[model samples]
Target chain A: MSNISLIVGLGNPGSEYAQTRHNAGFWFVEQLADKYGITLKNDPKFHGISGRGNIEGHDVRLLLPMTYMNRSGQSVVPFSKFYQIAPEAILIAHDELDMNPGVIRLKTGGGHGGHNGLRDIVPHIGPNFHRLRIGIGHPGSKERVSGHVLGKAPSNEQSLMDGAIDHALSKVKLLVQGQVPQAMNQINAYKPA
Target chain B: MSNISLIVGLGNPGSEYAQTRHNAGFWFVEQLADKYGITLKNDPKFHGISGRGNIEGHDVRLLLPMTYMNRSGQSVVPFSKFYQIAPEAILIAHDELDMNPGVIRLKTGGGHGGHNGLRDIVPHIGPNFHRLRIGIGHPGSKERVSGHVLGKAPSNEQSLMDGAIDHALSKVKLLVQGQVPQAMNQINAYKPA
Candidate 1:
């Protein structure tokens, strides 16, 4: 029953990458920042933009790694170590290719599943952190995957992904308060409309 | 001659490093942002916090690289390349060890003078950009230089550096309009009270 003290959003930095499917993780954190009024500022020691805020009476920190997607651990490792946060007490939100745009899933202690961001982070912190997988839907072939994630989603899919984020966001308070089982129950049930 | 289009402030990011002498460069851009109503935000593609604003009627981009001091060029090169800004069209503000705390200097095309941030940037962009050197005062010896820059200044010296920054800010209009020689002359003549 570990409480989440830190929520890390993994993504590449810059406007050109802002709307790409690869930045779903960043989108989640930006939405969280807005809802909680967390003013994410450049925090070099953390290697990202970060802020502190209260959610459901639980104090938590939000972080968006400014490093490119594959190098997320460069930001997460220092931030977690400096704050003395354990892997179980952190949550990483990122895009998932296996589900439809309007779906999201929550799981704890998993392998990287070939996700570059997760792959880089796993060696540093192990695999105990919670993962909030915001569905981005897969391209038909492996070769198309790179271009698909790097490109902008069509408007209809974009709206669906936005709604998926909104759904995940609603369960964040539960996640913050160490109610991981309940958060998983609700968030894992999300489906594309 | 090219007019200034991109103004880079070099320093480590994070609140812990916020007030150190090495961050004098960051202080400059932050002051410029506040004065001109520019809203700097995390730009990952540029690997820094960046914004666009009008300075002395010229549209300019402000950047503070989120990289540690040694990797400043990692941010500068990509941003410049994407925007098509030439080296001469960029102004880099950074702390200077050779000058006293109350002094500032503006110059064009010189060596990095062993500053890690400047050293990294020079190889990528050449030594053609305008340099705004904010004095941090010497640490008495080469061995002590790192600690001196990384540590916070006493309030008295901090205020003097602030004044130097303000004085430099006053003449930025000249630099923005390609009037570099006049800007240099006015900014370099300061004396501590």
Candidate 2:
């Protein structure tokens, strides 16, 4: 596990973007809110909507960046600077096109892997932060990549992601406690039946 | 009056900077919090500590920029943008070296008056937000200016400024409602004996 005081969900704003595969990160944050009974609201300075809640008595700040991908750090950076929350203390949840929808993964201190949100975030806060890569599966080609992630997943694909979300939600306390390796093993080993 | 939904107190971070003339703006935010029962905490994304509360049922946020004066806008602009809060809906509080210690002034759409905080803020959020200038009086000579505002006010000057804060708090409702003219009339007419 890793130390994470702030959890940022990377996604574009607007209702049309709601069901898009790109919003898997946003779904994770909302799922956390639902599990924790935490309510989030708009606060401009954070460059997003945020909520404060304690997970298993561990305080956590959840953020949803409403800006476009290339400027995701605009929301995450300020909050980190103000609270003196280090890059290592943050966990960014986003769609992972490289992995299948049924798979879940967590990584620390890595490259953006073609993530525009991660690219923008790197210069401001560095790459020490943890990443919750919610797999949406790849489109198998570059041109199809853009449309596939931005468009809503087919029902079957969505169901797989949903199951992964549920599985991740069940073990979030371990993630919240910075027990990343332990939680990662459990998530990675669990295969959808 | 301005439709100020966000009020920022400009000052340096650290206890050493507290109670200095530069922190008069910070004092105003504290007073507002005290009067309204709003408790401020650090919001990392805002690049400062902030709290939210309403003025006469009208919602507004209070911010204290933790960084030095010159880059205060870095803390302010994002919060304003993310919340969809227009520049006109924001108010910045700072020490006014030009005015006498007893004078209290409120203005909308004005220059930063060579104040470093406002100077940095201008390009980011623009010149439309309101300003609450709390006078600490000027140093007698040009060279003394630097030492003057950064230093703590003498007991008499401090007393004068304290009363002015009370007066400002008393009329904050008018300011929050965007009735700057009426609020200005009442504040401007006061003669400190």
Candidate 3:
């Protein structure tokens, strides 16, 4: 039987990019790591930081690619190859402009939401993988989209992100333990606290 | 509501570190990029690479850190804080020494597998995130562990890594979509093919 797992977080690497709305994926990852006590270290080869630990009685390895926000698939593809993981087993977490903050959505095998990162991953793993979408809200004007996502969130929104992070953590735990339907229901069913 | 998703793959930076066994996480990421049609570009701020995309109807972002394996947490902590993601939402993919080649395991939060990369992540995020462990097998003697993992897999064993990659990809999809339990059962319920 095949048993490889791949988790990809989308974001640019850099201090300037930190705390930006576009980096929500990275933020969620950090939260997960903290909750589980998994430390991420830099691995130049994967182009990001990674760690290994047990989550819910299983072995797991985490990754944070450094390939930047637009080219995330590059790192994911190689890592998948090395681990002998299949496209169906991979999962990607990233930011979404279509939903408001404090919302979490999960799905498997679908279209990219105008996101360059997901767009990149599709070709690498096909469109039959899992995805965790973290909403960052949309800008009123197209011109402000980039700036808004790339900038930090307002102070008031901090709690929203926190709630999302907690929800994501629980959902992830359920997901890792083979509770897909339950995870989806929990994550998608809950209203922002 | 706020939806937060993050996919993180772990590895070191530089061309020299590419293709090494220790970089399996990064390799899978690269495959994801290729399948998704995304590019991984360099970003100096987070000291890593990143991408943006959508998978399974979820918008996502991908990141790879360039921090070199030992200090991955340094980059992850800041990235999470900026995005407002907690430690539990992160999922990492990386190489494992505990299992033989062609083996893969999935878990959510426990302890680092004597991996410096994971150790660093634990400091930043905690110990309650998802981990995708791609078994590279033991390096024989403990003294040779580092060298073996750091080095490329033997030609004969290359296929094993390949198998692991396929397995990882499939599991990843389930994991991110809040199907960890299913992923665990599907991906980790059997031995290497």
Candidate 4:
């Protein structure tokens, strides 16, 4: 059986950044660790926190980069190279500004869609890997886009976000089972009741 | 080149649970996605969000499980089994109550040390895999131990956590290169300035 090795979460560091829209990727990864009982110890060499554990009987490496939000590729490229992991097996968890809160989309090998982090990764890892895009919703105006992603969602929207995250967490197993297209279809077509 | 087949981050769900000390594992994974520009999409089959991307030319799968903290093994076991990854290649990141905030440790297969999360994983994945323990520090008293590990750290301590997380990020490459002991030594022996 072939192993699926790498998992990466996108977010900035610091308390102020916690739970913010931009850090949704981080939140999603945290959910995985909790579900699996994995620990993310500080690894100075990767400039991030990481852990190794088994998932569905496969040896796995989970990474959370600490290079802030924009230069994530620097750490990713190095880690991937060290592990000899190809671009095709990597997965990314990040927020999408186009969808409403609680929405999620999964895809592979596409344009960055103007996300700075994606932009950086595509250059280093190429555009042939899987992507998990959690919806953060579009800002009412261009002026609010930055603030919307940087700030916490309103109380009314919190439940929506929570539900989406929960939904995302449930799909990780199929991913390792090599059901990418199926998982993608399920997630993209989902709608909260 | 060998590649990492699966990566899992552990943590619980719900908004109120975010930012708690126990969620460090999730936080670190998110950082990786941010740095690498990957996406962790909602995948109910895996019980978490997941994505695919590359690290050092290795193809990888990133997973964030949705199972609650104590039941993590339920998710991890199946994921590992399906992926066919060896126990030695697994990595787990979680919070440590024995060390101070910002401190981190890396080791393999000792004892769970009363960590329900670790306890759950060992039974499912065996004890030979890597463990990345991010120190959240014991609250000074037994009364506070539970709260300290479960609750969020004080704002003042955020910097220490960030510094340690940053250090961990940098060390990921060493881990992927199969330098587990070296990675452990580098993190364990370091004295934060």
Best by TM-score: 1
Docking class of 1: incorrect
* Better candidate by lDDT, 1 or 4: 1
True-structure RMSD, every candidate: 18.0, 19.6, 24.1, 17.9
Q: How accurate locally is residue A170 in candidate 3, as Cα lDDT from 0 to 100?
A: 77
Which has the higher TM-score value, candidate number 2 or candidate number 3? 2
Runs in model 1 lying further than 4 Å from the true structure: A1-72, A75-193
DockQ scores of the candidates: 0.02, 0.01, 0.01, 0.02
Clashing pairs in 1: A13-B44, A13-B45, A14-B44, A14-B45, A44-B13, A44-B14
Model 4 lDDT per residue over B1-107, tens place: 22234556677654434677877888877887677777888877766777777765556666676766776786778877887877777777787888777788877
Q: Give the CA lDDT, 0 to 100, for residue B146 in model 2.
A: 51
Tens digits of lDDT, candidate 2, B1-193: 2466888889876554576788899999988987998888998897889999877888888899875566688788887888888888788888998888878888778788888889989988779888888898998985566557656777998989899888988988887887778987877765557
What would the per-residue lDDT of candidate 3 be over residues A92-187, giving only the tens digit for each residue? 788888888888788878888778878877887789877788888888876557556656778677578668867878767677776777877888
Candidate 4 versus the native: TM-score? Answer: 0.50
Give the TM-score (vs. native) of candidate 3.
0.50
Taking the tens digit of each residue's C-alpha lDDT, what string does model 1 give over A53-103? Answer: 888898899999877777799899989999999999999999999988998
Ranking by lDDT: 1, 2, 4, 3
Q: Cα lDDT for residue B65, model 2?
A: 82
DockQ of 2: 0.01
